[PDB]
Amino acid sequence: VPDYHEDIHTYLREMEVKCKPKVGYMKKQPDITNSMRAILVDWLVEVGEEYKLQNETLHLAVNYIDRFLSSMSVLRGKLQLVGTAAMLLASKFEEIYPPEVAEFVYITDDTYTKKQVLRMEHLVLKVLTFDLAAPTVNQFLTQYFLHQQPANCKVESLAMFLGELSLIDADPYLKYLPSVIAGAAFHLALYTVTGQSWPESLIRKTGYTLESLKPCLMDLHQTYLKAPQHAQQSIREKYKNSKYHGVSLLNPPETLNL
């Protein structure tokens, strides 16, 4: 049943703009940087694999971190505390069976106490004022997947893959909306695999054309070519598993003809 298909997509489009983090938050952060955030997201990816968490959960946690860091200064010593509660919150929202608080304490080698993780949780909810139901790349991609002819599991898994790589790099992907990144990734996956293009039916659905996606696609395309040399390798590893049709082993296309 694509029962409320349009309506929901329309509602996600409106919400993605309001749930968008500040594009510059990192300039105003005195004690942290883009690569430190890359290191945290990478680690959150391992946490997701370790605990067998949904992809939606990881994507949600990231959105929290960025939004929380769009308004609160954090020290190097605490970026990870914020990171852990963001994930605990993500799991509680999204997971049939979230790991216990203790587990989140444990996966830091006990850097912080349970008492601190719950206090950060509270603090994170305060700052987000409980707006946790944020649209994500994974939510758009999943709808777009309904537009393929026919369903291709490689296309899907490889789309998740690229969608996921964008989480890691604030510069540049904090300036692209979830729906656009998903646009870039879906198109990029399809072309790699079957050699085909952003379908005309999604141009109708979304109002995006190859043209409108070019900029994010240009970035996504580089990110893909350079993937195997990135300091962060947890997504790539994750995406080797049969679970994802080993898509991280496929070769990026050397050109995009745009």
Binding site: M36, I39, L40, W43, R76, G77, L79, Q80, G83, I107, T108, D109, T111
Partner: peptide
């Protein structure tokens, strides 16, 4: 893993 060491 402790992260920022």
């Amino acid at each position: 893993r402790k992260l920022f060491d």
